[model samples]
Target: MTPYLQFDRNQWAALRDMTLSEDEIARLKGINEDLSLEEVAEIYLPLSRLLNFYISSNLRRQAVLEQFLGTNGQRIPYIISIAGSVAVGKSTTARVLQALLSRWPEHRRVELITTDGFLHPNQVLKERGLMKKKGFPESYDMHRLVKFVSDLKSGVPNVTAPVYSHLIYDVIPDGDKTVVPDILILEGLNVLQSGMDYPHDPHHVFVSDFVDFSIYVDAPEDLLQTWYINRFLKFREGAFTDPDSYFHNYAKLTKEEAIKTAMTLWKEINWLNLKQNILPTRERASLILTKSANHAVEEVRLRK
Candidate 1:
């Protein structure tokens, strides 16, 4: 049997009631201004509704277990993971989902965090000569990441994770952001990955192991390259110009120069990691959001 139940844009959009206020529409934004009200209603709304069903299913299953074990049980946080290549709009998806999920009155305590926070500090990576592999699996402190999620799964009351600063291009020394919620959405480049495609303990727990539901944002590699380059150019015009920005030096580049630099970075780093580590894990996700050339999610495939 096929592992996924596929739906084209129209098919998926048909499953939900699409209605929102002007203010509601104004509050949400997508990557590079690509997120439209129609996109949110057509894609994210249905996804959030489906997640509600999953939460309900979990509650029912737990009730049966509680009865079987002859003891009372309390509800636990349901962890949802979103993974994809850089510039593919997974961050946009995460934020949209967080907003939509939180609006569901029954699950108001939805929290979102990116695994970028779990990455080793810039100093640490540079010292180890791993600056080039920033988004790769080896660049992250997997042990601490595993433990952070482990704590959340175990119902630890005040779990905190380090926060990364895009401006400084480093992990802040005093960065600790706490997350406590009924449902937690964890987004990252490789959150769905179980390992680096090597043999392991066969029983070693992965961060993905704790994920109740996972999403993979997908696009053609060429399209991803375009988006990455465009984003870099945009950063050069805006954020990169900030003196505190790590990429400040790139702000003064000519358009052609910026494109060359962006292309080189994509080829040497993000592109390789996406090909070798991220894309291969797409099938492992509970759902996959496939984007169109214009960056709208044109299709969704949920695991069956």
Candidate 2:
């Protein structure tokens, strides 16, 4: 077994200068993600620089392969997968990367897709008795998701993905989004899960199979619990009040009740999923960002 090259916050901070402005930081930050320009410079700027290097090297290799084969290969999109437990700020990380990578003159076309879009519709989940297990690996349309990634890797242009709304808590019919970019960022809890190779699903290809690089956002279970509860409370005050929101009922709950509900959900669903499914995939990432209890990235780990 190889050990990860570890860098503490101060050590990692030395890797990059402050390049982001307040407005840019605000744009890249996710709701309640508590991101700052200082944190972005200390944490994400170096990561982006490393990814830029990977993309440049890969592009050169692709051109060489094409010349050697005496044929123009399909321009395959670079796929990056970001994975972590729910409420771990993986979405924020992905958004920040997308903002950073797209700003690069050579890689101006960067698109992002979340696996939540590939999640089975609420009705389908209800029928399959998987509503409570929504974030579980089995809750996704694995076959469809695989085919979508395969097409992108095969250079299929203008591929459209189904749209999912957190407010509505369902896949929006006729709400597909198109993707045709130089880089594609796929973010989700179970992006690194290995596909089942059952006889009936012999051709199954896991999403990670097409990933050019992978990242896993990590934090302690106790820290994750606190963050999850805090996010739930924030949602109650924000999105949950919308009439169309699936969690609108939660807004009516007292703070104590909402906290209790969040705790139960975390203990019953998210905690189990993190332990049994998400955490196991952490070792599969090319890089990992370990967060402190304060929701700040504390250490950086690059696979040796």
Candidate 3:
């Protein structure tokens, strides 16, 4: 079999000729329906099979480790983490992977959980005077996040995790789901961020510690900048325009004004977080899905 090439932005864009069939393209368009044969044959068939291989490989490795330690027939769920910058489409990737993996013959009980649900409560952010710094590592409950992963890794039954609501822009305090899955996929923007300089720091758990596999959704910095700005414009026109919306004031601003705010926010806050905290962790991912300016992943980099 031919090996997949890992190309950088321009080269990857030039070389990306992979296309979906007419039916498979609909899935990309966000038409939620049962997976069609055309869709499976073209897109999910390979991906699901690949995930199956990863899961099986994980189980085999665990069995071997247990056997070497004189423990028998022990099973541990394989954890896969997906990390990326905000608005980079990591959420969709995780959800899609979850759906596809659930349909795979070998792995039918895959569960996906987003780390957004574990973000610090709005009151906590306000109390800490970090309302503008939302999405930063400190904005999340790192201890709870680590404990969730650790319990799952320990093969505990009925692991439950909190859920976040995008509409309200806060974690739903009592909303969580119990999961005992064969495979677990966790998604978040700062999931893979690292801070090993302060070894004694309580907030640091090297979030990648419990993962059997991990992926980072990536794009050019400028492309991400543009996408973030556009998404903010869309939010103003749609979500923020609602009087009941948390960011309703943003909708009252002029288009140019909103754009300016987005640019400044991205440059001063989001970009700093990305560079200092998020992007540096990309190299630790098992795979990197490099998207183009058009928001489609043009190339995949599989770590050797």
Candidate 4:
């Protein structure tokens, strides 16, 4: 009964009887992550339904506003910003939402873009001495990222976002996708971050300013650290072996060495970024999904 509606797993599951097939669940989840059909029924289905209702209401409101302003017809894209710490499964949530939202009866054109694409190139980061601070806010091209979201919110068609490659761990130059999707999911580590700019600072607009809705994926620090290290170990066995991988050297490390390196990265880079930049923005989200140690969402809080 607080300003935020809090729901436990059982209560939330009862709120949504809709369930996805096991195949769909597997397709939506990320590598080395654990998510199931039951998790979707309890967490994402209700979220999708709520978002659909919000979109419908927004369309109606836009119609009335257009009439009042005597403006021509136009449908503004609904932007959803999914923000969280590294290895917290925000990407999985964005992908699942895209799949669910595209199946909605009215809104079928859904697209997703990750903010990693906006990161400064490796050379640029190297010159700026920000390679160790890769995921930090200062490592991103905030101007371009804000402009991209702003254009989308302004109903600009054929907007493009640069592509990022996990294999190379860099932004692919000239690798961009141009689209005019009805719904856009912008997932990133710092999407919800509003820096130390006053409201009247005209030049300080952020990407989150254009977001119609936002979700923050959260988990305890210990759990996040474990997941990150586990993911690193998995990558060593898999992607890290690739010649072009930024972490190729990790593949050659001993099991003990790999664990130590992973822990050091988490402690020095990801943990600091999470504590300073990401977690502070949790209250700014429309909804927050709190995950348990096993990666299952245990509680949901909807902002009032």
Candidate 5:
């Protein structure tokens, strides 16, 4: 057996091989498709399996909760939260975990929900002059997001949530997903933020309350800066260039101007979100996935 909290790359490779198939392994390539197999074996594959275990544990806990509450025994849903800075591969991580966990027959009905839906509309942010701080905790409709998670945990069915499109960089008015999931994966930047200091509007009942398990993806600030700049440039070329895109005008900028703009946005908005909100919630996570400069996870810190 491996020593607690210590594993070399080869050891991780063997460990992952013991649990995952070659096809599953292939699917774990990083966003840039540059992360090595060792990275997947060392980081993501293990993380996915850990999430799988949590989902199962959640089912068991619900089974006991229902019995104690004198309700008829039923398989209750599991809620897992994934929080991280932008461009840190959080959505991708959630998607991979959902797919991997579903491979287990017990968790076949897993669902992934980006907290983009929970964000206030761009108009509301603009009205509040928080357009630049749109990803921060206060920029979201916390009350509504909290209510939706609370209702969801209470076994509400066919619940709908507004959808936010990064492509358009706004919350679509009529677009929402009706969620009735056995395992709900909530992914966002601030899902793990602490209670705000509003006495009348207590913050204890936020999204983390309903989270059966939580993960925080992490990396150095400099690494995030690089990733943010790179992703913004890619998105500008691919999505922003479209005539109907929300940021179409940005696509017309020179390469140098676009890179400078991307860096500026990262330093101003994304960096603030990471420093002031997202990183503080690290201790709340059941696990922490720490990434390297190259956008690949290096180690996982478990909360015991």
Candidate 6:
């Protein structure tokens, strides 16, 4: 049997009886052309509704377990992971989901975390000759990432995760942030990945173990390459202009040079990682958001 129940844009949008006000849309941090207010209403509202159903169902299961164990249960964050290839827009989706999920009365506290912070520092990567392999499952400090989520699930209050700076393209020393929220969205390239590439554990407790639900943001590989190149060009005109940016030198690239650089980077690093590691894990996600050339979600495949 097919593992997923597929829904096109029209069918998915009709699942929820909800709409986001203009104010809510305005308050969103990453509102962009591709992610207009209409997109949120159609793509995220029903998603939030589905997540609410899962949380409520989990509560019911907890109550039953509490009775069986003769003990009261404490509330814990509902962990969600959003995984995808570079430039697939996982961050935007996570931010949108964070906002919408928090607006729900039952799960008012929501936070988003990215696995980039858990990556070994650039210095370490350079020393290990893995700088080009960054974002691979092998590049991350998986034990720490696993422990952080395990502690959060265990109700350890005030767990702080390392912070990564896009400008510097590394995990900064003394840059850590703490959050205890009702729902936690873990977004990154490797959030849903596992297998022989990872450090072997006798009884493996993968990050997906703590994940109550997971999402994979997907698009055609060629489209992903285009988006990556386009984003790199934008960065050249924007962030790369900052002196402190790791890619500051790219600011001088002509349009053609910049495109060539971006294409090369994709072929050398991101595409290899995505093809060999990330994309294969797409099936592991509880839901998959498939985007079109314009970057709007064209379909959602929810696991049965």
Per residue, candidate 6 scores C-alpha lDDT tens digits across 187-210 of: 998888764558543227878988
- Tell me the whole-model lDDT of each prediction, alpha carbons only: 0.84, 0.85, 0.74, 0.83, 0.76, 0.85
Better of 2 and 3 by TM-score: 2
lDDT of 2 by residue, 109-197 (tens): 99999989999898989998989987887677778888888999987877989888887778998899988689999999988887542
TM-score of each: 0.93, 0.93, 0.81, 0.92, 0.87, 0.94
| Clashes by residue pair, model 6 | none
Segments of candidate 6 deviating more than 4 angstroms: 29-33, 199-203
| Top TM-score model | 6
Model 5 agreement with the true structure over 1-304: per-residue lDDT tens digits: 3212533434444555435676666766643365566665566676667777776676677678887998884445688889888888888778777766767778768888888888888888889888888787768877888777788788777667889988888998888888867788889888887567224356777688888888888888888888888878778878554898866767889989989998989989888878877788777787777778676555666664
Backbone clash total for model 4 is 0
Clashing pairs for predicted structure model 2, backbone only: none
Cα lDDT of model 3 by residue, 1-304, tens digit: 2233475544533432333456545654563332244433433445555667778777778778887988874367788899988878777778777766765566767888888888888999899888888778778777788889888888788788988886677877788878867888999876786555223346555678888888888888799889889878777777554787755678778889989999998888888878878898888888788777566556767765
**2 versus 3: better lDDT goes to:** 2
Q: Give the lowest summed-lDDT range of ten residues in model 6.
A: 194-203
What is the alpha-carbon lDDT for the whole of candidate 5? 0.76
After superposing candidate 1 on the true structure, give the runs of residues whose Cα lies further than 4 Å from its correct spot. Answer: 30-32, 196-203
Deviation in Å, model 2, residue 120 alpha carbon: 0.9
Give the worst 10-residue stretch by lDDT in candidate 3: 31-40
Give residue 80's lDDT in candidate 4 (0 to 100): 90
lDDT of model 2 at residue 292? 84
TM-score, cand. 3: 0.81
Residue 195 lDDT in candidate 1: 55
